[PDB]
Every structure is written in structure tokens, then in C-alpha cells.
Enzyme design. Structure first.
Site, PDB file in Angstrom:
ATOM      1  N   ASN A 253       1.556  -4.170  -5.110  1.00  0.00           N
ATOM      2  CA  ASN A 253       0.605  -4.671  -6.114  1.00  0.00           C
ATOM      3  C   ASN A 253       0.696  -6.183  -6.268  1.00  0.00           C
ATOM      4  O   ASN A 253       1.415  -6.855  -5.508  1.00  0.00           O
ATOM      5  CB  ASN A 253       0.899  -3.976  -7.438  1.00  0.00           C
ATOM      6  CG  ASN A 253       2.204  -4.435  -8.039  1.00  0.00           C
ATOM      7  OD1 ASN A 253       3.213  -4.478  -7.341  1.00  0.00           O
ATOM      8  ND2 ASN A 253       2.190  -4.810  -9.321  1.00  0.00           N
TER       9      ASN A 253
ATOM     10  N   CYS B  13       2.314  -8.089  -8.257  1.00  0.00           N
ATOM     11  CA  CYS B  13       3.675  -8.611  -8.450  1.00  0.00           C
ATOM     12  C   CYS B  13       4.742  -7.997  -7.522  1.00  0.00           C
ATOM     13  O   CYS B  13       5.914  -8.299  -7.659  1.00  0.00           O
ATOM     14  CB  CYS B  13       4.059  -8.458  -9.920  1.00  0.00           C
ATOM     15  SG  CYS B  13       2.932  -9.356 -11.011  1.00  0.00           S
TER      16      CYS B  13
ATOM     17  N   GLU C  96       6.157  -5.025  -7.210  1.00  0.00           N
ATOM     18  CA  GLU C  96       7.145  -4.023  -7.671  1.00  0.00           C
ATOM     19  C   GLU C  96       6.670  -2.561  -7.666  1.00  0.00           C
ATOM     20  O   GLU C  96       7.490  -1.643  -7.826  1.00  0.00           O
ATOM     21  CB  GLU C  96       7.681  -4.400  -9.051  1.00  0.00           C
ATOM     22  CG  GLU C  96       6.898  -3.915 -10.274  1.00  0.00           C
ATOM     23  CD  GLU C  96       5.648  -4.712 -10.594  1.00  0.00           C
ATOM     24  OE1 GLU C  96       5.119  -5.421  -9.712  1.00  0.00           O
ATOM     25  OE2 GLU C  96       5.191  -4.613 -11.760  1.00  0.00           O
TER      26      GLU C  96
END
EC number: 1.17.4.1
Length: 657
Positions: free
Chosen positions: A349, A351, A353
Site C-alpha cells: 500500500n 506506506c 505495511e
């Protein structure tokens, strides 16, 4: 220049050789009296206030109607009973500036911190007054912080952070992907571009789609497998020396690529449509470790030759210059993935994670049938490690946070993103993370890079995983349901629990064991019993844990960001014409040593910390690398290869001092 700014600036005026840390308590008191209290809208009583907020379209009516007024009043009173005060100017500033409900003209404050918390709790608890009180206490103690979108929007007239979309290889799919991205962005959207045909294969490559996406842009990301022909064009979008501005990019790296770079020898990238025509499956869905040679030797597959080592150098160089791309070590994700039977994890995604199975949809024109696969969405929140340890509340916090995240999933109603809607209902995934690792360690005299710090993290996150799994099975029992295709997972076969039934995870250092005094540490016997409980009842959630960056909310929590080492002991940031100073929460003259800045640390030991945590996190961990301009390309490749070697799943934005 307001007085709170003046007082905050005094922190940096040396007095008796020291910083004046205590000036920030004066600063926040001045802000609290002369801004927050000053500009808070007056109401004669809570009833008038709530009637006003419902009648004027600030709050939703339904969630409040589930309670009697007297119960609502008691929940609010619970929040105010704590006597909570923000301990720094920037913590108060961030809450009141970015989260507190303001009037429509934006001049006045309609919510105290306590009011936002009470509303969120009442929303989560769904008519259960006692649970609403538990939620208030959990948040007002700062044990648990829902993500920005949940915390901001709960009760106000969808709350999901991350969306990840598959994109099939057609113009109608691309068009729908743009449309869905636009509607979800009004959230973070990440797109897998690895199934799209490469440059030339369209008889009428991916950079063309990235351009459309970048212009369309909430915030966007795109991911590409390192073996896709377009990989170099994809990376060149982030060249300074060039002519995508806003769009984040990630590259997905199978072990086969790392191996080919070790075996310093020629390598190939592929034209995906020729693979699809030839094998009837997308390249992105095939096992590259198994298939690479067959692709090379198949003449109906088109390829390009590249130097794999120089590609890895270019990745590191680009990361040094731009911070991009993010890297996913795909096999490090999939060798511990519980749900490979649904799919391998193929991308991540915004970020880096979120790490879950997905299945491509097919969106077709008016005369054909759509087929709905599985996109990904994940709603998030974070434990505050410091307050959880001090309250001895790992079990209670994990389980109650899990309930809140489950409630957000259950009430999510996504229209016009059908594979997102399908996935939310089928997969029921959530993302419980954590913040304040460095701050907690520092305030207890434990260096981030020490073996004692890793010992703490090992035990802490094992406990988070234990109680998260236990709550997921308890919910499955109570609901008589499990996530879609639970029976084929490693939770069901038992394989997930192998290391937990055969190995103890209690602290190996006595100083660390003393921190956990008053909390039961799960043993191999507890894990054996949990494994059997899961065998009987299954689990509600396909995925449960992920550690997001927590950039904004960490200020509200007076927390160091995520599980990362702090970047700056004291942040200087500009505020209109003035500056503001934010010392790391807990920083004092006498503990200066323990708030070591990330740029001065050995990144190999940072990798060891993240690897240690990652053992107990089923998804991923947004992992920023902290570099200096003196490091060689070879030094950068060595860090990255160590990360790979130690099982690291993803690395996020590279920061250079």
C-alpha cells in the site's frame, strides 16, 4: 507573536548550560487558556450541545440514538474524569488544529479532546454503554489511538485508511481503476501495475498508466514487479534529471532476482502479455523461482536482457536521491504468509505495511460480464507502548482495540469499488500497530540498538500477537463465522503456531523481565492451548497486525513515531512567521543519550530490531531507512541485502540527513 509561541521558543534559550524543557508546559498552558478555552463554543449543557450538533448536521443521529441521554452523559463524564492535559505545545496544537471539530466558518472549536474521544467511543460501542466507557478509558489513558481517518471522522455526518487495487490488462480495467482511485481518494490508493502489458504490446507501456494516475491525483501509489519489462521506464518517472511528481512507487523483488544479482551474470525481464498468451496465466500469478528459466527458453515469450547488479545499484541510487522506490521482498512476505492458498502477496500500500492476498477483477464493456476478484482495504489503529506498559494492559488494550477495528470493518459500506466491498466482507482484515517504542525504551534507560531493546520488542510483540489471535478466535466463536477460506490457512493447519509451541519468547535479560512484572507472559503451553482453540473455532480476521508510520497522530499521543528510531531530538518547524520547537516526548537533559538520532545509528542494528518485531506481525512494518550522504552505493546495497537476508518484508522511504 502569540505568547505560547514565545514561551515555546524559550526552550532553546540556554539557562545554566541546559535547554529549558519546562517552558513547553508554560507554552501549552498559555495556548490552553488563550486559544483553546478562548475559542471553544459555549453551550449551556451537554444536551443542548448534542442537539445542536445533530440538528446542524455535524454529527450523525443514529449512533447516538442507541443510548439514553443519561448514559451518553456518563460516557462524556468518564472522559473528563481523567483530568487529561497535553504536556507539550505541539501535541495540543496538532489535536486542536487537525482533529478537533470546528464550526463551519472554522472560527471556533466545538470539541475538546475529551469530546472527540467520547464520540468515537460511543460510535465504537454500538449501544453498549459499559463498553463505551472502556473505550473512553482506553483512549483517554492514551493506551490506544485509532488511525487519523477513524479518529477524525467517527460520529461525523467512510473511515478506512488503505486501499490496494489490482488492475487487469485492458483499457476498460484501466479506466475503472482510475475511476475507483478517484472516488476512494476523496483514502490512500495503491495500484498493482504488474499485470499490465509492457511497452509495444498494445496494438493501437505502464508509464502511460502512471501518467494518467498521477494527473488524476488523498494520495496514490503504484507497484511493479522487478521482472516486468517496463521496470526501467517505471523507475525513471522519479529521476530528478527528467521531464510522476506526486505518485509514490514501489518495486516488488522476488528472491530469484536477488540470486541473479549475486550470481553476477546476465538476467532477463519479460513482456507480460506474451507470458499470458503462452501460459494462460498472468506472469504476476506464476512462481518466478520455478518459471524463470522456462520463460528464458520459451521463444514465444519476449524478453530483454539486463544487468541485475546494476539494476540493484540504480534502485539504491534512486532511493538515495529521491527516497523512492519502496522495496518489497516478495518471498520474505510469502514464506510466512498465512493465506497463500488465496493468493501470494503481490504488492503493498501507500506506506508499505499492508500485505495481503488479492485477486484481479475484470471490468468489461456494456455487452460483457464483470468478474469481481479481491482488492484490499485495511482500517488501522496503534497501541501506545509506553501507556500500555505503565498500565500493564497489553491483553485488555489489544483485545479492545481489535473490537474497535472489527466494528469499523463491519460498518464499512463501500459503493462503486466492488472488489473492495467484496474483500472487506470476505476477508475482514484489520491493522493494529504500535507507536512509542523508542520513547518507552529511552525513558527506561535502554538504547534502541541494544540487545535489551530487541529482547523487549520480542516479548512485547509476541504478546500482541498472542492476544490478537486469541481475540480473533473468540470473535469467531461468538459469531460462528471465520474469514473466507480460513480452513485452507496456516492457522487452520497449525503450521502458523510451529515456532510458538516449540520456543519461549519471555525476556532473556532480567531488566526486561522486570518491565513486564504484573502481566502474564504467554508460554509455549498457552500457545499450545491457543492453537487448539483456533483449531476448534477458527479466526474472524484474515490479517490482524501492521505497523503504519503514525506520522500525524503520534503528536497527539506525545509518542515517538511508530517503532522507528527518532530522527531529531528537537524538531524545528515553521509556524507562519515564527518557529516552533518539539522535543521528543520524554526528552530531558539527563536522558539525552538514550534519544540517539536515527542517522547516527548502525542501520544493521535497526534492521535487527525490525526483523525481531516482524516475527510477530502478520502483515508488515513501514520501515524508513536513515542514511548519510557519505555512504557509498555499495554501503546502501549492503544494508538492503542485509534487510533481505534478515527476512525484512518491505522498506519504505529512504531518508538522508
Amino acid at each position: 507573536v502569540p505568547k505560547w509561541i514565545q514561551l515555546n521558543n524559550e526552550i532553546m534559550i540556554q539557562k545554566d548550560g541546559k535547554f529549558q524543557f519546562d517552558k513547553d508546559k508554560e507554552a501549552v498552558h498559555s495556548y490552553f487558556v488563550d486559544y483553546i478555552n478562548q475559542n471553544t463554543v459555549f453551550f449551556h449543557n451537554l444536551k443542548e450541545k448534542l442537539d445542536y450538533l445533530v440538528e446542524n448536521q455535524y454529527y450523525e443521529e443514529e449512533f447516538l440514538s442507541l443510548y439514553s441521554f443519561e448514559d451518553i452523559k456518563e460516557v462524556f463524564k468518564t472522559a473528563y474524569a481523567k483530568k487529561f492535559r497535553f504536556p507539550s505545545f505541539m501535541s495540543a496544537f496538532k489535536f486542536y488544529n487537525d482533529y478537533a471539530l470546528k464550526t463551519n466558518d472554522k472560527k471556533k472549536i466545538l470539541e475538546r479532546y475529551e469530546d472527540r474521544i467520547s464520540i468515537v467511543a460511543l460510535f465504537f460501542a454500538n449501544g453498549d454503554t459499559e463498553k463505551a466507557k472502556e473505550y473512553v478509558n482506553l483512549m483517554i489513558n492514551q493506551e490506544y489511538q485509532p488511525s487519523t481517518p477513524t479518529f477524525l471522522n467517527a460520529g461525523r455526518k467512510e473511515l478506512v485508511s488503505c486501499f490496494l487495487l489490482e488492475v487487469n490488462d485492458s483499457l476498460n480495467d484501466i479506466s475503472r481503476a482510475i475511476d475507483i482511485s478517484m472516488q476512494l481518494s476523496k483514502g490512500g490508493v495503491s495500484l498493482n501495475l504488474s499485470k499490465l502489458r509492457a511497452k509495444g504490446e498494445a496494438i493501437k507501456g505502464v508509464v502511460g498508466v502512471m501518467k494518467l494516475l498521477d494527473n488524476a491525483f488523498g494520495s496514490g501509489a503504484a507497484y511493479l514487479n522487478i521482472f516486468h519489462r517496463d521496470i526501467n521506464d517505471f523507475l525513471d518517472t522519479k529521476k530528478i534529471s527528467a521531464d510522476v511528481k506526486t505518485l509514490s512507487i514501489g518495486v516488488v523483488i522476488p528472491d530469484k532476482f536477488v540470486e541473479l544479482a549475486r550470481e553476477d551474470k546476465a538476467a532477463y525481464v519479460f513482456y507480460p502479455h506474451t507470458i499470458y498468451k503462452e501460459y494462460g496465466q498472468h506472469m504476476d500469478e506464476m512462481d518466478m523461482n520455478e518459471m524463470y528459466d522456462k520463460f528464458v527458453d520459451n521463444p514465444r515469450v519476449k524478453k530483454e536482457k539486463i544487468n541485475p547488479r546494476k539494476l540493484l545499484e540504480k534502485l539504491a541510487m534512486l532511493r538515495s536521491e529521491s527516497g523512492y522506490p519502496y522495496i518489497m521482498f516478495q518471498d520474505n512476505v510469502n514464506k510466512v504468509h498465512a493465506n497463500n492458498h488465496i493468493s501470494k502477496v503481490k504488492f503493498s500500500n501507500l506506506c508499505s505495511e499492508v500485505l495481503q492476498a488479492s485477486q484481479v477483477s475484470s471490468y468489461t464493456d456494456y455487452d460483457e460480464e464483470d468478474e469481481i476478484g479481491l482488492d484490499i482495504s485495511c482500517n488501522l489503529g496503534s497501541l501506545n507502548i509506553l501507556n500500555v506498559m505503565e498500565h500493564k494492559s497489553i491483553e485488555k488494550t489489544v483485545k479492545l482495540a481489535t473490537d474497535s477495528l472489527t466494528h469499523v470493518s463491519e460498518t464499512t459500506d463501500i459503493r462503486n469499488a466492488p472488489a473492495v466491498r467484496r474483500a472487506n466482507k470476505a476477508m475482514k482484515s484489520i491493522g493494529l500497530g504500535a507507536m512509542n517504542l523508542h520513547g518507552y525504551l529511552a525513558q527506561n534507560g535502554i538504547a534502541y540498538e541494544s540487545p535489551e531493546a530487541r529482547d523487549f520488542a520480542n516479548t512485547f510483540f509476541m504478546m500482541v500477537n498472542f492476544y490478537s489471535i486469541q481475540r480473533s478466535a473468540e470473535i469467531a466463536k461468538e459469531k460462528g463465522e471465520t474469514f473466507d477460506q480460513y480452513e485452507g490457512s496456516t492457522y487452520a493447519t497449525g503450521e502458523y503456531f510451529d515456532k510458538y509451541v516449540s520456543t519461549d519468547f519471555s525476556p532473556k535479560y532480567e531488566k526486561i523481565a522486570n518491565l513486564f512484572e504484573g502481566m502474564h507472559i504467554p508460554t509455549t503451553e498457552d500457545w499450545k492451548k491457543l492453537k487448539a482453540f483456533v483449531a476448534e473455532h477458527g479466526m474472524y480476521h484474515s490479517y490482524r497486525l501492521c505497523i503504519a508510520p503514525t506520522g500525524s497522530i503520534s503528536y497527539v499521543q506525545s509518542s515517538t513515531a511508530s517503532v522507528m528510531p527518532i530522527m531529531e531530538r528537537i524538531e524545528e518547524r515553521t509556524y507562519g512567521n515564527s518557529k516552533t520547537y518539539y522535543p521528543m516526548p520524554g526528552l530531558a537533559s539527563n536522558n539525552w543519550f538514550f534519544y540517539k538520532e536515527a542517522y547516527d545509528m548502525d542501520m544493521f542494528k535497526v534492521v535487527d530490531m525490525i526483523a525481531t518485531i516482524q516475527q510477530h506481525i502478520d502483515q508488515g512494518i513501514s520501515f524508513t531507512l536513515f542514511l548519510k550522504d557519505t555512504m557509498t552505493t555499495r554501503d546502501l546495497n549492503r544494508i538492503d541485502l542485509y534487510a533481505h537476508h534478515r527476512g525484512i518484508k518491505t522498506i519504505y522511504y529512504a531518508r538522508t540527513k
